[PDB]
Every structure is written in C-alpha cells, then in structure tokens.
Write a protein that binds this ligand. Structure first.
Ligand SMILES: [N][C]([C][S])C(=O)O=P([O])([O])O[C][C]1O[C](N2[C]=NC3=C2N=[C]N=C3[N])[C]([O])[C]1[O]
Ligand SMILES: [Mg+2]
Lengths: 1334, 153, 153
C-alpha cells in the first residue's frame, strides 16, 4: 500500500536523518528532502535499503525528485516494473590470500608508479593534531590494537592486488620525543618531519598502509599525526580509525568488536551486486566516451608529466559554523545537497580558471553499501570513483547552476557503478587521453570529520594533507567543529606559484557570498579583485590621442617646413612641401572625379612617392583610402572593390570603364591642388585595409582617423619620433603598419625611406637604404626583420636604427638577441600586438632584454587609449594566467568592416565595459599584468608575416572548376610554407550500362586456388606456432573450408595457376620467415609470392588479365609521348611481372601508393625510366592532377576503405578524355584469403562488378568491362573534363590570391579526413602536408 | 564597503565644489556610477553609486535576499549598489550627490526613515507613519502618524 | 571609461590578514606601549592584548567559535576595545551595539544576527542570546594567541 510504503520511507528517513518518526511523517509528499537535510550519503543508504527490499531504484530517480511523493510514485511503479536485487554473493574469499583491488584502489595503486603521470605518490592522508600531553605508550598500544582489530589497516599491496597480513613487519607508531630539544630546533625538525611524512610513499608493499605518529615538542605540546594510505581506508574509514584510536587511547576496554565483514568478502559481494549496474554504466560511458570533456584546462606552470615527485600544498579555509549553517539553509531552500553546493562552486571556479567550461572531476563517492550494518565500522577503502562530467553554464544564477550540477552528479552516481578508472582506461584504449586530475571529496556527514571519541582525547584536526596521485587539485571538505573545512590539496609547482592561492580565495569568496547572499545571483564568479584592478589599470591608460584627422600632422609639418625631406626613394628624395603639393593635387583631382568626404578610394600603386602622395590626397580629399598592392590579382581586386564599395581606384592606369572608375595617379598629379585638406572629423573613416576573409570574400577593416591617430600618438609619444628620424616603409600599403609609417612618421616630421616595388621583399635593398639614409626607425612584421638580419652585419649595417617596431606576427625570442648588437646603442625594440581591426596596434612590449620565463614575446601593456580583455567563450573576463579570447577595445578600434555589418556585429561586440573587437587571438594575462598572446584557435594564420585566413585559400580553391572542397594549412619546416588539399568533384552521371564477356573463367581455377591454399596451409600448419591463436584457429578451419573439404582437386592446380613446386616452396619459406621475423603485416606486401595483389596477378590467370589491361596504351600506335599512372604499385610486384612489355616506346610511367617504403621497394625492383611518387599519408601531389592519359589499378581497389576513394583518386589523376584501367576481385581468391589474414584485413571488401560500375559512374567515369568477369573483372572507363590540372590550379590561384597566400605546395585527396566532431581534420591534414614536403 | 571607499584630500576647497566630493576610490576598491538599469553612466551624469572591490561586506548577516538586491554582480564584478546618487567629473573626481531614498543622516549617524516609520507603525493605534529630516539649524528628525480607529458597527 | 578604470583599479594596499593581527603583533613587539587612553587610566598594548585574550578564552569556554557572531554591548572604554579584540581573537565576529540601544531593537538585532553571545556588563545566560559579563570574561584563561582566522572570515 502507498500509505504503508510511506510509513516505511518515514522510518528509513528517520533512521538516516536522525529525526523523529512522527516529524518525518509530517513531511509533505511534495516536500524536498534535501530541504529536510538529506544528503547523497544518506540517500545512497536509502537506495540500498530500497534495493534490499527489492524495490530497486536508481539514485538518479530518487535524487532528481527527492520528495516523498515522487519516491512513493516511483516505488509503486517499481514494485511491478522493477526486478529484485537478491544476488547470491560468493560465500567467502580467503581472508589471508591476495585479493583484487577496488577500482579506486587500482587507481591509487597505479599512481605509485614513478613513470605514472603525476604519480610517484602514496594517495595517503596526513592528519595533524595538537594536544598538550598524551602518553606515547597508550598511543602505541592503541595503534597496534586498531591494526589487529581492522584487517585492512594491516593490508599489504602487491602486483595490483591486496593481501591482509596477520601482523605487518614494519613499525606502526612513530614516536619522536623532542622534549629535550630547543623550541626553534624542535619546530624546524617538526617542519622537516611534516614535509617528509606528509608526502611519504607509505610502505604499502610491506603492509604499512597505516602509520600513526607522535612528536613531543619541548613547549609542552604533543602533535599527534596520522599518515594513512587511502589504498587501505576511505576518508570515512579514516574517521572511523580516528574514533577507534580515541577509544583505544582513552579506554581500549570500550572497543566494542572487531568488525567481521572482511574487506575481500565485501569486494566480492559488491562486485556481484553491482554487476548489472556495472554493465549498464559501462554502456553509458561507452556511449559518452568520445564526447567526454578533457581535464580542467587550468593554468599549468609545469606539465604534470614533468613532475617526478609531486609535493602537495594544502589551501585551507575553515568555514565558520554560521557560514555552514547558512549554506545548509540555502541549499535546503534551493532543494540541493550541501555537497552539490560545494561541488558546484568548485566547478564554477574551475570553469572560470579553465579554458573550457566543460571538464571532468573525480568525485569519490561514499560506497559503503552492504547488507551488514557493521560495514559502517570497517576501515577499508570503500570509496568508488565517479568520473563526473560537469558542463558549467555561464550567465545563470547560482541556483540554476547548483541545481544543474546536482542533477548531473546524481545522474552520474548511478553511472559510477562503472568505475572512473575503467572509464579512463577505455579512453586510453580508444585513443582518448582524457583524465580527471581534479578531485572533489565532500566528507560532509554532520558527526564531524574528527569523531568525538578522538576529539576528547586529542584536539580537532589542526592540519592535513592529501597525496592523491594523478590529481592536480584534490579538493576536500571536512566537518571541522561544526563548520566546514575547505581544503585544496594542490600540487606544488604544478600550477603557477600564485595561482592556487588566488583560485582558492575566489572559491572561498564565492562560498561566502553564497552564505551571505541569495543564490539568484550570477554563478559567474568575479575576477579576483587584484586581477581586475590590474587589468583596469592596463586598460585605462589615458589616450595620447590629440583627436584629429589622420592627415593633419603631415600637412602641419609640410607648412612648417616644406623643404624638409619627407620621402626617400631609389635615388630621389621628396620634401614635405613637394609631397603635400602632390597629395593636394591628387585630392583636387579626386574631388574633380566625384570623390567626397568618407568615400572609399582604392590605392593600387607600386611602392614609392606617388603611392604616399595618393594616400595623402585620398585623406586630404576627405576620402578613405583602400590600399591594394599592385600585385593584387584581378579577381580578388574586383572582390575587394565590390565589397568596399569603392568610389574610385587610384592606379597607374586610366580606365573609367573599370568596375570602379580607375584613374592614373600621374593624371591626378596634374589636377589642381586644393588650398588645404578637406576638413574631416576625426571619427571619419581613414582606411579600409583589406584583411583576408574566412568565407573567401576579402574583408575590409574600416579604420577611423580617430583610431589610427590614437594608436599613432600612443606610439609616437613613446618612440619620441621627431624630424631627424627616418623610417623604412618595408610594410606594404595594404598592411596597416604602413599607416604608422606614412602618417606617423610624416606627422612627426620623420622622413620615410620607401623601398621600390622591386624592393618590396629585398633585404639587401633594405640594408642599403638604411645605411645610405641613416634610417632610425624600423617598422614591420618580424618576418621582414628576420629576413633583414639574415644579412651579416658587415653586409648590412643597422647601427643607425634608434628604435624598432615589430608586430602583426610572432617576434621570435632570439630576435632581440640578434637585434641589440645590430641596431643603435640604446636598441629600443618594441613588440606590438593586436589585429588590423584595432587601428594598427594595441599592445607594446618593450624588449630591452628577454627574461627566461617568456615562452614567446608577450603582448605588453595595451597601448594608451586602448585596452585588452581576455574572455571565456561566453564573454566573461578570464582570470590571470587563464587562456581566453583576446578582446581589444578603446579609441583605436576600427569603425567595423566596410560593408559587412553582420561580421562587424559578430566581431566588434559590446559589453558593460564597452566596445570590443573579439580578435579570435588566444592569450592570457599574467600575474604582473603582462598579456601573453598564445596564437590562434582558428583559420587566421601568418604567412611571410602577412595575414591570411585559411578559409580564404580554401574558398579560392573551391572556386576552381572541378573542386568539391579544400583544406589549407601552414606547414612545418624552416620555410613555414602555406600548403593545401583538394577534394575533386567528379560530376556523377548515369553510366551504369554494362556488358560482360564472362566466357573465360572456369570453376577449375577456384578448385586450383583451393588446392594451392591446401598446400600453403599445410606448409605453415606444420610450423603453426609462428601464428597467433586466433590465426591458428582460422587457418585450421580454412584447411578444410577453403582448401580441403570445400574444393578438393588434383595437383593440376599448380599447372593452372602457374606457380609450381619451387614457387610453393618459396611461398612457404617466405611466409615462415615473415611470421618468425615479426615483419608482418607490412613485409607481406614486399613479397611477390605472398602479396594479395601479386598472387592475384598470377593465380586467377592474373598475368593474362595484366596483359590485356596492359593493352589500350596507345603510345606505340600513336607514336607520341603518353603518361600512365598506377595507383596500386606497393612493391611493384605484378608490375615486376609485366614491366618488360609494359614499357612501350614513348611511355612515361608513374607509380603511386599510400606508402613510402613499399614504393621504395618498387623503385628498387623496377627500371629507372619509371617515375615514383608516394601518396604520403594518403596525400596526392597536385602536380599530377590531370597529368596522366591512363590510370591503372590492379586487384587492390577493394583494399581502399571505399571504392569511391580510389575511383575519385583515379578520376582526378586522369587527364580529360583519359581512360582508367582497372582489374578488381569480385570473388574471393583462397590464397588471397591467406594473404589478407596475414594482413588481418576483412575479405568483405569485395563486391560484384555491378556495384563497382555503379560507384565508378558515381565517380563520373564511363566504364566498359572487357573479360574474365567473376574472378578478375577488367574494367576500363573514360574520364570526363573534371577541369583539374596543376597548370589550371596555378592559374586560378594567380587569379584569386596574391603570391603571399597561394599554396606553394598543392595536394589532392578523394575526401577530407574528419575530426571527432565531424569537422575537417585540419591538424591531420597539416601534418600530412608537412610529411609530404619531405 | 568595509568602512570607507573614497578619499578626497582637502588641502584647500576649490570654488567649484558644491559639496566636498568623494575623491578617488581608496586603493583596493572602486566606484561605479550607474543608471537604474545598471549600465555605467558617463561623466557628469547623476547615477547610483556602486562600490566594489576587496572592501565589500560579505553581505548582510541573515538577509540573503537583501544582499542579492544590494550586492549585485556584473561583468565588472561585485558591487554594493548603495542608493547614493552621484556623478564622475571630467577629472575623475566623484561628486556624491546625496540620496534619492529613505536612508538619511541624523547627528552624522545613519537612519533609514522606513525604520522610524515602521517603529511608529509598531505602536498600538498607529495605521501608517511618515518620517523626515527637517530644516533649520537643528536638522531635527521628525515624523507623522496615521491613527487606526478600530472601525465598528 | 579609461579614467574610471584607473580610479577603480588602484592596487589593493591590503596585506590580506585577519583584522586583529596587527594589534597583536604590536603588542608582542611592544607590550609596554600605550594602547588606550581613558578618563585617567591608560592601557598598554600588552595589557590590552592580555585582556582581549582572556576575553577570547572565556568566549571559547562559553562555546564561541570561529566566525560565530558575538554581540558587544559595553560602555565606551578599555573594556569595550578588549571585548572586540577578544571576539576577533576568539575567531568570532563582533556585533557592536551601543549600551544605549533599546531592549526591543536589541532583541531584533540579536535575532537577526543570530548572535552566539552578547558581551555586556550583565551576566544573564537566560537572555535571548547568552549574555555574559565582560568582567567575568576578563577573569577567563588567556589564549596563547588569537585563533587563526582566514582573512575572508
Ligand atoms: N599589422 C597587423 C596588426 S599588428 C595586421 O594587420 O595583421 P594582423 O593579422 O591583424 O596581426 C597579426 C594577427 O596576430 C596577432 N598579432 C599582432 N601582433 C602580434 C600578433 N601575433 C604575434 N605577435 C604579435 N606581436 C593579431 O591580433 C592578429 O590576429
Ligand atoms: Mg590580422
């Protein structure tokens, strides 16, 4: 009955909560029992009592709706829908034999290993207690009594299994009577002792799991300490131990009984009990293993694998009794367990400090669940490790957050049946390196951590330390007094030396806040105010900006000193006055040409004075200059123009009929000079520097005069630029560093050294110019200065160079090391940060020297007038040392993108902090407020220091005719080349028409192959130990099923196949050597007598099919050069059989295969007139696209993961109107079965030729089947005009990309490899390309 | 906010001060001037003063609700939400501008007029009450009573 | 925004510590040093510290424990300072009230506060909160040192 059931639940809740039966009964159906002080420890005990009862329920079920009514309902349903749990336990495990480890036990054991990741540690608790005076003899007696009483306390650990000794051979009590020492000496020795034994590797191997100890300090103080290996004892077990100790010290007579429930018995019973749940959980985890989050992405000073001896540091916060009370109350009001509160908080802090909000944390569960109540007296390691997946939502109230967290945890508690350890093991087995190095241990049962029994004899817990291995951060909670002890047992040196402290302080602040505030408050933690303050300081630096039009200063200068040198060129030099007059003439021409304030103007000129004048006149006319390198291709030019909405294009070409009106700059120089520059508001658009754009359409960064001038001022005031200075305009016009060159330098009065167009990348020229003109200021991407510096000092003199700006690409740490001896005394290297979209720059690290701790030259302080924010994916500012998205803000931001409002909105985001560019740069603040830039998560990459979005190069390839999809990457090596990958489009069509002259094959060939299989199976099975057990079983079954009892026949088999007794002897000897030498499976393909395609080339009359496939190469009849390619070369074995006839006059042969070594063997055995190219990592060079009139595949198309793969590869490799030649296996070859079994590959790859031709037509080819049908189907198909060609590709990339971002090396794939997420595997591709390089 | 959250040093009073302003925030703490909506107000703009930083109280002792109400959060962190009116100057100085609400000063000590009103409403025979600080040199606190008449037949 | 960020971002002078730390440090350094000055009498750092510690020990004897709210309702003087330093020293949180504070409002505060204890000139364990005589507390055993408090407390 429901009511009776309610009564029973009342009874259990009374028992568990320690409340009156009546009172409990009073609790409403709808009353939240976590509201009534229930916790997960109690509720797992209730779940166990319901399971004993037979009313089996999932803790998830109970704890998702933790109210009487819900449970009642559930139980009502369960009683008829749920099975009982009356599992018959094993009667007993021998109580003295080595028995199996618990999962958690296993984990802790594995950690002891020196070679284990962050291991080499005990997993022991060290406890510390303070008491005035206690008898050492009583303590020793109590320690030995507890060891004898509790089997587990004397448990030896070996070979991944645990054995309980009668009496351990090693000491149990460590007495250090230091009453004779000085107070200072005693304290120092104690400190040493603490720092030793708190981290001690307990001799578990000798039963030393438990080691009590005492120090008698001379100041009349006895410091009880307890080194307990949690291998042995759960921390609830530790407190039990505490209790036991206290009783044995005060009165061992009152020790009730040694618990009879032997731990091995417990383990066996528990295992048997959980088997079902275990399997369920395993299925759960397996369904979620690929989607598990990684470990918390916390800042790590030192790699955990790099820590040989991890020292633990506790961060302790004793939550007051009132605080505890408040937490409890609030948790109750919000319908959550206090442990979920703490855990939620912990998770939040992690997330905030974690690059990823989603992470794993090891939640040790209380898992004491057995039939015998006496189990709550046992001292064993009753823990079970929960692999808690936590996905902290940002922006939600802590109420929401906590609720979510609880739900997750409660759901996972059931799933914990399948241990965390095994989850992780499967992750490694599945290639997932994921782990849970962050522990959350909520030991929150209100009896107090330190039992009364213990408290009476000795003082409450003074200090403690965990040593959990493989654990970064062992978070624990203890009932200290009536309060809560917040413990962060972090690893010394693992984290930044100041990190853990900070993070713990934030944790404590959040908890306290919870205490004193409603949970409707945001879960998003505030930054540690120190951090925020620092960053505010960095961000708030006043703008140096004398808010003005970007051209103002230059013109000012020119009026002040028109005769002053402004520009320096190949030989000529241009004064301020001349440059200003030319710019004003250009501006007058533009206004005559219809240009007007703020109207976008394209500037496509070779580098030189006219370029400068054009830009200046653009600005002067009130317009916004859209710089484009003359090198800019027509197509991308058009794209830019269109996107830009460019009113006009200044060029060396007069073409009003162009897309935009295109004017000759020289004709504009003939125009009437304006009296003065058009009055522009500083806020007006200055330039539209076209960044590369991820969709393929180039993106225009519309930077205001205000913004550019802000940056320039910020840097001018710092560089102290003056008239005497001279810059070098190495920076392209369409690279915004030139904005500082032009405007900055000229406004300051500094002269500009202008490399010629031909000098755009000429380091020698640069050097010469520098030397000649005494250049005092340099400004570039570091890629250009590295190039410069490549020149010897003698060949290149930089000693005039007063200061250096390097920016917009990674400045290598040794580059200041090269530069200081080269440049002027007082070197003044500045490294500057921030994207095109923040004016020019947004940071400055001065580099008077590189300190050792820089992993890269950081972004320094933000420049004056602008700022940085490092943010989570959610937009919330990340703490210090925390990797997040760099957010540039301030006066220096671009107005947006030119004609991309959407993207502008996306990127130039808003906040209560203002406007922010949202760079997609990764980076982190440091504790000193420096800002480490950390590269990029995305497709924006640096090539030759220039900015390229790989999605642009990919889209410029996909624009190409015959391209389906493409991938681009920056490759390794010194070159640091861009490269890319192609996915052809094959134009699928209906070419399934087929005719088949199947008159040649006969069943005698099948019988003959069966006989040869019999011979080889007998040859190897006479020495069967060379195979493995599975291969032995398979070969034994085959000896009949494919050789003897299926198709028995005569020895005529050999005379039909071709290979005679000598060939069979060679095959057998090679097979025996292959298996004995451990060279399988690779060396099988190196043998002509054993490779499946090689044997298929002779056995099923494969040589005749090879001869016919060798026909239709018309080079001798054509009397002209022909190019032929092979996709299934491998070791060139069948080719070794047919090469002499294959090499027809004028025939050019190339060999392909997805292996370097096999093709090396093929080249070794085949003559020199044959080209060999490896599909390195399955990667096809683009050079071979559409280059071959004929393509050949031989008895290996099935070996490809899909016939579509090889068919697409051949179609791409075929010159238009070229013909594929293909022989493939439709029916299994019994000897090829042995070959595949040596390869251990499935014979299911094969299919009949109708499917082959269907796929081939789906590949766009038009097939014709020649002969031999079922055994060897000789198919030849024509390839249509895919349009793919190296030449063609090149042309297209020339048409659509500047030479700075064309792939220098180009590749091809039938299909892109995919990441676990289903996205393009760009890493893999990158790697592939890199390897392909050489 | 701990004890204090600003410091104006006063070596001399420049004529432009209509009141001695809150100066700079004290080290380790901060001020925000916000709209009713929580967004920061520009300079010279009258808004709610938001104190923040290391100096904030943990909250109210046993008033989580009120704590939440007052000690509000933002992307800028934790803020007390004083109900002081005030404005930032162009120089960064923070003119405090008194209060819109019932929190008022008597003998320099802090009184909420809603307390004095509720302490009168607690009185037998009181329906509703109003309190205010009065004019004159005394700057006295006074209050007004609304009797409850026990209506009957 | 920049200006205000500057204002707000001033680094914390805070040597993050328990509020009582410094005084005890001083006391240890110079116990003889004059700490308080009263009507006629003067109290040394040492004396004050001792008194505070005695108070603290009495508090902990009275069941007081870290972070637990303690009412301090004493006439202004050395005893009142001693009382709050001991409250702090005990690990507790002092809830100061004027002796002038009326019974009703006192009760209100006490209730609201969840005050563990009330330091007074009056011994009345039967009060709403356990009410202790400061003088009696002064007779309590002095603590070796202040209870170690986390600054966040
Ligand atoms: N010029 C430049 C600016 S500076 C440009 O425009 O380009 P970009 O792309 O934007 O830039 C570059 C990239 O990356 C980053 N950065 C800057 N700076 C730098 C870098 N990296 C490294 N290092 C350095 N320094 C940005 O942000 C972008 O993204
Ligand atoms: Mg960029």
């Amino acid at each position: 009955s429901r009511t009776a059931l309610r009564d029973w639940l009342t009874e259990q809740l009374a028992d568990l909560l320690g409340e009156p039966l009546a009172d409990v009964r009073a609790l409403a159906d709808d009353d939240d029992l976590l509201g009534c002080g229930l916790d997960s420890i109690r509720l797992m005990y209730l779940q166990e009592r319901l399971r004993a009862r037979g009313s089996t329920l999932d803790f998830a079920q109970l704890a998702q709706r933790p109210c009487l009514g819900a449970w009642l309902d559930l139980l009502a349903c369960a009683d008829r829908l749920s099975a009982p749990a009356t599992v018959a336990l094993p009667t007993a495990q021998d109580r003295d034999q080595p028995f199996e480890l618990s999962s958690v036990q296993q984990a802790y054991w594995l950690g002891r290993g020196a070679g284990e990741v962050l291991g080499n540690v005990s997993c022991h608790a060290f406890l510390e207690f303070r008491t005035r005076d206690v008898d050492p003899q009583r303590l020793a007696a109590a320690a030995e009594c507890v060891r004898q009483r509790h089997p587990m306390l004397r448990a030896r650990f070996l070979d991944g299994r645990q054995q309980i000794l009668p009496t351990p051979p090693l000491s149990c009590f460590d007495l250090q009577d230091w009453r004779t020492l000085q107070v200072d000496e005693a304290e120092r020795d104690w400190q040493a002792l603490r720092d030793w034994r708190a981290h001690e590797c307990l001799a578990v191997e000798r039963g030393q799991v438990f080691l009590l100890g005492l120090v008698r300090m001379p100041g009349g103080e006895d410091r009880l300490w307890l080194s307990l290996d949690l291998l042995a004892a759960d921390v609830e077990s530790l407190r039990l131990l505490l209790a036991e100790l206290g009783v044995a010290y005060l009165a061992p007579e009152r020790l009730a009984e040694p618990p009879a429930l032997h731990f091995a018995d417990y383990l066996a019973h528990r295992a048997a009990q959980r088997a079902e749940a275990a399997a369920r959980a395993r299925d759960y985890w397996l369904e979620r293993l690929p989607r598990l989050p990684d470990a918390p992405a916390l800042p790590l000073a030192c790699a955990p694998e790099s820590i040989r001896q991890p020292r633990t540091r506790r961060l302790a916060f004793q939550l007051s009794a009132g605080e505890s009370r408040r937490l409890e109350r609030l948790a109750a009001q919000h319908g959550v367990t206090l442990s979920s509160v703490f855990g939620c908080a912990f998770a939040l802090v992690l997330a905030r400090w974690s690059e990823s909000a989603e992470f794993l944390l090891n939640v040790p569960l209380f898992d004491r669940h057995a039939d015998d109540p006496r189990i709550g007296e046992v001292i064993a390691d009753f823990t079970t490790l929960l692999l808690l997946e936590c996905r902290m939502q940002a922006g939600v109230s802590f109420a929401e957050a906590v609720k979510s967290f609880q739900r997750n945890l409660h759901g996972a508690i059931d799933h914990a049946a399948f241990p965390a350890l095994e989850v992780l093991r499967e992750a490694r087995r599945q290639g997932q390196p994921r782990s849970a190095p962050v522990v959350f241990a909520s030991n929150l049962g209100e009896e107090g951590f330190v039992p009364a029994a213990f408290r009476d004899a000795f003082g409450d817990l003074h200090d403690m330390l965990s040593q959990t291995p493989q654990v970064w951060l062992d978070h624990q909670l203890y009932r200290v007094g009536d309060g809560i002890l917040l413990a962060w047992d972090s690893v010394v040196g693992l984290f930044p030396e100041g990190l853990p402290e900070t993070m713990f302080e934030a944790y404590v602040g959040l908890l306290q806040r919870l205490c004193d505030s409603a949970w409707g408050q945001p879960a998003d933690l505030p930054l540690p105010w120190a951090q925020q303050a620092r960053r505010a300081l960095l961000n708030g630096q006043p703008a140096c900006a004398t808010a003005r039009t970007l051209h103002r200063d230059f013109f000012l200068r020119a009026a002040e000193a028109p005769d002053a040198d402004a520009l320096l060129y190949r030989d000529q030099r241009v004064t301020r006055g001349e440059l200003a007059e030319r710019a004003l003439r250009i501006a007058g021409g533009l206004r005559e040409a219809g240009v007007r304030p703020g109207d976008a103007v394209e500037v496509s000129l070779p580098r030189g004075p006219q370029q400068v004048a054009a830009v200046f006149g653009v600005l002067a006319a009130g317009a916004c200059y859209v710089p484009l390198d003359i090198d800019q291709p027509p197509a991308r030019r058009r794209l830019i123009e269109e996107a830009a909405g460019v009113c006009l294009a200044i060029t060396e070409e007069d073409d009003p009929q162009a897309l935009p009106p295109r004017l000759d700059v020289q004709r504009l120089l003939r125009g009437p000079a304006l009296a003065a520059p058009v009055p522009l508001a500083p806020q007006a658009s200055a330039y539209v520097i076209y960044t590369s754009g991820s969709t393929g359409v180039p993106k225009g960064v519309e930077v205001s005069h205000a913004a550019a001038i802000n940056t320039i001022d910020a840097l001018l005031d710092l560089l102290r630029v003056n008239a005497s200075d001279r810059l070098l305009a190495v920076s392209a016009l369409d690279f915004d560093l030139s904005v500082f060159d032009l405007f900055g330098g000229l406004g300051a009065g500094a002269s500009l050294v202008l490399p010629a167009q031909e000098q755009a990348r000429d380091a020698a020229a640069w050097a010469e110019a520098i030397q000649r003109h005494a250049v005092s200021l340099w400004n570039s991407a570091p890629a250009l200065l590295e190039m410069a510096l490549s020149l010897p000092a003698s060949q290149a003199d930089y000693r005039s160079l007063r200061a250096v700006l390097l920016s917009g690409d990674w400045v290598a740490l040794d580059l200041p090391g090269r530069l200081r001896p080269r440049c002027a005394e007082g070197c003044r290297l500045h490294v500057l940060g921030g994207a095109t979209e923040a004016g020019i720059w947004s940071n400055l690290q001065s580099v008077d020297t590189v300190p050792p701790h820089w992993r890269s030259i950081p972004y320094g302080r933000p420049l004056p007038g602008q700022a940085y924010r490092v943010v989570d994916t959610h937009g919330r500012d990340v703490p210090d040392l925390v990797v997040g998205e760099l957010w540039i803000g301030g006066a220096s931001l671009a107005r947006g993108y030119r004609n991309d409002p959407e993207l502008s909105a996306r990127r130039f985001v808003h906040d209560a902090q203002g406007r922010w560019y949202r760079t997609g740069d990764r980076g982190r603040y440091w504790g000193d407020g420096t800002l480490e830039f950390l590269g990029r998560v995305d497709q924006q990459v640096k090539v030759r220091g220039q900015r390229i979005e790989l999605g642009e190069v990919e889209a410029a390839l996909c624009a190409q005719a015959g391209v389906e999809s493409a991938c681009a990457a920056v490759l390794g090596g010194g070159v640091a080349s861009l490269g890319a990958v192609l996915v052809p489009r094959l134009a699928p069509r209906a070419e399934g028409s087929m005719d088949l002259p199947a008159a040649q094959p006969f069943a005698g060939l099948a019988e003959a192959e069966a006989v040869l299989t019999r011979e080889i199976l007998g040859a190897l099975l006479e020495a069967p130990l060379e195979l493995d057990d599975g291969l032995r079983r398979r070969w034994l079954d085959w000896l009949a099923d494919s050789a003897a009892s299926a198709l028995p026949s005569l020895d005529e088999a050999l005379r039909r196949l071709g290979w005679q007794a000598a060939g069979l002897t060679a095959m057998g000897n090679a097979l025996r050597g292959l298996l004995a030498g451990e060279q399988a499976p690779a060396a099988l393909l190196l043998d002509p007598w054993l490779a499946p395609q090689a044997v298929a080339a002779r056995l099923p009359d494969g040589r005749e099919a090879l001869a016919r496939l060798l026909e239709a190469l018309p080079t001798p009849a054509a009397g002209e050069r022909l190019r032929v390619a092979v996709l299934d070369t491998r070791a060139g074995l069948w080719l070794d059989q047919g090469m002499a006839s294959l090499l027809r006059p004028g025939l050019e042969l190339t060999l392909f295969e997805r292996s370097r070594v096999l093709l090396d063997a093929a080249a070794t055995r085949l003559p020199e007139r044959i080209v060999v190219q490896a599909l390195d990592d399955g990667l096809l060079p683009a050079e071979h696209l559409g280059r071959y009139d004929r393509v050949i595949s031989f008895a290996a198309l099935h070996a490809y993961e899909a016939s579509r793969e090889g068919l697409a590869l051949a179609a791409a490799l075929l010159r238009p109107q070229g013909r594929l030649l293909l022989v493939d296996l439709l029916c299994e070859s019994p000897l090829a079965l042995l070959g595949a079994a040596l390869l251990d590959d499935r014979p299911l790859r094969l299919a009949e030729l109708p499917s082959l031709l269907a796929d081939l037509a789906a590949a766009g080819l038009a097939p014709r089947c020649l002969w031999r049908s079922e055994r060897i189907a000789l198919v030849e198909a024509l390839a249509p005009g895919l349009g793919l060609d190296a030449a063609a590709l090149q042309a297209g990339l020339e048409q659509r990309l500047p030479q700075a971002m064309r792939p220098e090396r180009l590749w091809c794939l039938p299909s892109l490899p995919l990441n676990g997420n289903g996205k393009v595997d760009r890493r893999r591709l990158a790697e592939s390309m890199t390897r392909a390089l050489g």
